[PDB]
Amino acid sequence: IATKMRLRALSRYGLDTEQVWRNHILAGNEDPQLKSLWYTLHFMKQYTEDSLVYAGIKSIVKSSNLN
Amino acid sequence: GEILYRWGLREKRAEVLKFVSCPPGVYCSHCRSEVRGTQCAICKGFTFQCAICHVAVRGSSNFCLTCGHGGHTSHMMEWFRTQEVCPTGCGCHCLLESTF
Amino acid sequence: MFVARSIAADHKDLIHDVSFDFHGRRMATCSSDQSVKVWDKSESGDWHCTASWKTHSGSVWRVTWAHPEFGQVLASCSFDRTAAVWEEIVSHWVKRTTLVDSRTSVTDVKFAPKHMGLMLATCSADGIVRIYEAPDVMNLSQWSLQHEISCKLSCSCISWNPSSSRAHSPMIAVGSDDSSPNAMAKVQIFEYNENTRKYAKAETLMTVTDPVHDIAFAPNLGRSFHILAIATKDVRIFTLKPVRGPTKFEIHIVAQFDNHNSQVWRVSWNITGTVLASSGDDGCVRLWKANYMDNWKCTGIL
Amino acid sequence: VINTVDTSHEDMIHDAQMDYYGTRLATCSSDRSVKIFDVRNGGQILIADLRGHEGPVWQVAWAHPMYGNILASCSYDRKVIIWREENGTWEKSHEHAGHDSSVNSVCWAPHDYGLILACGSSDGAISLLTYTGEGQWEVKKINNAHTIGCNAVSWAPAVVYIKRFASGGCDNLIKLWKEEEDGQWKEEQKLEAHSDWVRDVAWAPSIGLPTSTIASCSQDGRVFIWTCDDASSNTWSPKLLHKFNDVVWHVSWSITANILAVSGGDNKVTLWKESVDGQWVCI
Numbered sequence: 001i002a003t004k005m006r007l008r009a010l011s012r013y014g015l016d017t018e019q020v021w022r023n024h025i026l027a028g029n030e031d032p033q034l035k036s037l038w039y040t041l042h043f044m045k046q047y048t049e050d051s052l053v054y055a056g057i058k059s060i061v062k063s064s065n066l067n
Numbered sequence: 068g069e070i071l072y073r074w075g076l077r078e079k080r081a082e083v084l085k086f087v088s089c090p091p092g093v094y095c096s097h098c099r100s101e102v103r104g105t106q107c108a109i110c111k112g113f114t115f116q117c118a119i120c121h122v123a124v125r126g127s128s129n130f131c132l133t134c135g136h137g138g139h140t141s142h143m144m145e146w147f148r149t150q151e152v153c154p155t156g157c158g159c160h161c162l163l164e165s166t167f
Numbered sequence: 168m169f170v171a172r173s174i175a176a177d178h179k180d181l182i183h184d185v186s187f188d189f190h191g192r193r194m195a196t197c198s199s200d201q202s203v204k205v206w207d208k209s210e211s212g213d214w215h216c217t218a219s220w221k222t223h224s225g226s227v228w229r230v231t232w233a234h235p236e237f238g239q240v241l242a243s244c245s246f247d248r249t250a251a252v253w254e255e256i257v258s259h260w261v262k263r264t265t266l267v268d269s270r271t272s273v274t275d276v277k278f279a280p281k282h283m284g285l286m287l288a289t290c291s292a293d294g295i296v297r298i299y300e301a302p303d304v305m306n307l308s309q310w311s312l313q314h315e316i317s318c319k320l321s322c323s324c325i326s327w328n329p330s331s332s333r334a335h336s337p338m339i340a341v342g343s344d345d346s347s348p349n350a351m352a353k354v355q356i357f358e359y360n361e362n363t364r365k366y367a368k369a370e371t372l373m374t375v376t377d378p379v380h381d382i383a384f385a386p387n388l389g390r391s392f393h394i395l396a397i398a399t400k401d402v403r404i405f406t407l408k409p410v411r412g413p414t415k416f417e418i419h420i421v422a423q424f425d426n427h428n429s430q431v432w433r434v435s436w437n438i439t440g441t442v443l444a445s446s447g448d449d450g451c452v453r454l455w456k457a458n459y460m461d462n463w464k465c466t467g468i469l
Numbered sequence: 470v471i472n473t474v475d476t477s478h479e480d481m482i483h484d485a486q487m488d489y490y491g492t493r494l495a496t497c498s499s500d501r502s503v504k505i506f507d508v509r510n511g512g513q514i515l516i517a518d519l520r521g522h523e524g525p526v527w528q529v530a531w532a533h534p535m536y537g538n539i540l541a542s543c544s545y546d547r548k549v550i551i552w553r554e555e556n557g558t559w560e561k562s563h564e565h566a567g568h569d570s571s572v573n574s575v576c577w578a579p580h581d582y583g584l585i586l587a588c589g590s591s592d593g594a595i596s597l598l599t600y601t602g603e604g605q606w607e608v609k610k611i612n613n614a615h616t617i618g619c620n621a622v623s624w625a626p627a628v629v630y631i632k633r634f635a636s637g638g639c640d641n642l643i644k645l646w647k648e649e650e651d652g653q654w655k656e657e658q659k660l661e662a663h664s665d666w667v668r669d670v671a672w673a674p675s676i677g678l679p680t681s682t683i684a685s686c687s688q689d690g691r692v693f694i695w696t697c698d699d700a701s702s703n704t705w706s707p708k709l710l711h712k713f714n715d716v717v718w719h720v721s722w723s724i725t726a727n728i729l730a731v732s733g734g735d736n737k738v739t740l741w742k743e744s745v746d747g748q749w750v751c752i
């Protein structure tokens with residue numbers, strides 16, 4: 001893991017705030033886990049720009065042709 | 068030496084004057100006290116800490132007057148060669164405050 | 168997937184110990200000719216020694232550097248009951264105040280993590296571990312005597328806990344070297360209550376009986392548990408998850424192999440706490456790592 | 470060589486002096502103006518055209534670069550006006566007019582003392598302006614200096630302090646001065662070997678030889694060299710170099726005090742050099 005962290009830092013991993021999901025293309029080759037986080041973060045971010053979205057779906061669908 | 072100063076050579080004036088027989092507030096990170104020197108007097112520790120390098124500075128340095136962050140001279144020389152922000156994320160364009 | 172190579176350092180006597188600073192740019196080498204040397208690493212990559220001096224009467228077992236935030240300081244240990252603190256002035260390595268206050272020979276010398284001062288942890292063969300403190304960082308000539316530890320056994324190896332959180336007090340591990348048939352213990356763990364400034368006993372690994380030669384804690388890196396290495400005839404990696412007097416650690420055992428068929432001398436971790444190198448008296452050494460199933464497996468013996 | 474420069478002024482030129490480095494050139498004139506050029510590589514460029522000083526200007530004097538870019542400029546209007554260079558622009562900084570008659574001579578003091586400017590007017594007084602800090606000037610006067618009035622002043626080189634300058638005026642006597650421990654500018658001596666009127670006086674720079682040399686110039690025309698090498702005897706022996714046929718105006722030393730240049734009413738400039746035998750020959 002230490003070797004991977006070295007190549008991640010050299011390729012400016014994590015600092016692209018314009019488009020978020022493009023980070024998973026900078027992480028390396030393929031990781032289903034790491035290609036799921038950024039997509040899960042991109043959809044959350046582009047809804048406060050158009051605060052409770054960060055709470056997760058559990059709090060959303062607990063206090064509750066669809067609602 | 069005065070003649071050499073008139074001509075325009077300042078290194079060779081110092082070299083000559085070196086042979087004359089007769090002679091001619093950094094905050095600490097452990098106790099937050101005004102210490103004048105490279106070593107503290109209360110906790111007896113290093114007071115200056117490089118803002119790029121985090122190895123204690125005992126020799127030459129430079130810093131911004133308002134932000135008060137600086138370190139080894141070559142370190143800031145490389146850093147400020149291409150950017151314009153305080154390296155410790157302070158928000159000052161020290162190039163406009165350090166240089167009058 | 169490790170590819171071995173060779174270096175271009177030429178010596179005269181044997182080599183007993185080596186150590187790396189913090190940045191992996193300098194190292195200190197021992198030699199059974201009453202001499203120690205340090206080498207820099209040129210930008211091109213070629214090494215070149217830049218120091219050599221006799222330091223004691225006999226042989227020097229260990230040299231360990233210090234954290235650079237206190238300059239460039241070394242710490243050597245010798246057979247003839249001594250433990251000194253070297254410094255550097257620039258060049259010439261003028262020795263600071265050597266301090267020997269033991270009776271037997273000192274077994275090992277290791278520094279302390281940088282987050283609590285400039286402590287030092289000499290231990291001797293008789294079973295006395297001594298703690299030195301220097302609250303005069305501007306001048307490293309004065310050393311006090313904080314709490315010493317008595318265990319009434321033999322001491323071979325010492326190890327600290329590199330954890331830096333404010334939720335874990337410092338801990339000391341101690342290794343024996345005795346071959347006595349009284350097989351009771353071989354590795355104890357000490358702790359530190361802040362309310363008494365003493366050193367109690369935390370636990371005891373009543374699962375290793377053969378002589379132990381080296382103990383190396385694994386770096387923390389934020390995990391919720393700690394890891395130790397025990398260099399017996401079998402290489403062993405334990406595990407303690409603190410439960411919620413001293414704290415009650417619940418031990419385990421996660422690996423025990425013997426694919427070296429020799430006397431496993433020393434073990435030490437890497438910077439990131441995943442790969443662990445193990446040595447022995449069988450010619451060439453092995454590298455251990457953890458796989459996807461969290462079941463440690465060999466990784467490239469060479 | 471030569472570095473010909475056209476002044477582009479409307480009247481006569483009364484003084485001209487260069488900087489401490491060899492890069493700038495100030496010019497006084499009779500059009501109530503002071504033009505600062507930039508004489509580098511022959512360039513006749515302009516940097517300033519400072520105006521004011523109602524009368525005709527007579528003299529200028531640059532200050533030591535260690536204190537920044539300053540320039541003193543006296544004139545007929547009985548006002549000394551002082552300039553600086555802030556943000557690359559030349560501006561009027563301070564004016565002082567504590568003189569009944571025209572101020573004739575200005576001379577900066579040696580930099581070891583500090584920043585003192587000595588101005589001697591035609592009303593028989595010397596005004597010394599000391600820079601007190603924070604843009605403040607202290608003025609100490611010496612009333613009843615000469616019978617008619619001072620014409621020129623000069624400052625002696627600093628030795629190991631005792632401040633000391635030398636003034637001359639229309640009474641045909643050269644006077645010496647010294648600052649007491651309290652601050653009283655007590656007179657020390659007076660020299661009398663001239664006939665008509667002394668116009669300019671100049672004190673030689675020192676390079677360590679135990680010998681003080683002062684030149685002088687008279688209206689009838691006589692350059693007298695006042696050597697004095699008696700250490701602490703305070704005795705001066707006049708000599709002579711020539712007797713011209715006009716009014717001798719100005720005398721200037723070299724940096725090593727081996728060549729003297731004398732200019733007078735004859736509309737010509739002469740150079741001189743002391744021989745091995747002790748006589749002064751032209752060149």
Ligand SMILES: [Zn+2]
Pocket residue numbers: 095096097098099100107108109110111112
């Ligand atoms: Zn302190």
Ligand SMILES: [Zn+2]
Pocket residue numbers: 117118119120121122138139142
């Ligand atoms: Zn640094």
Ligand SMILES: [Zn+2]
Pocket residue numbers: 134135136153154155156157158159
């Ligand atoms: Zn800052």
Ligand SMILES: [Zn+2]
Pocket residue numbers: 131132133134135153159160161162164165
């Ligand atoms: Zn700043």
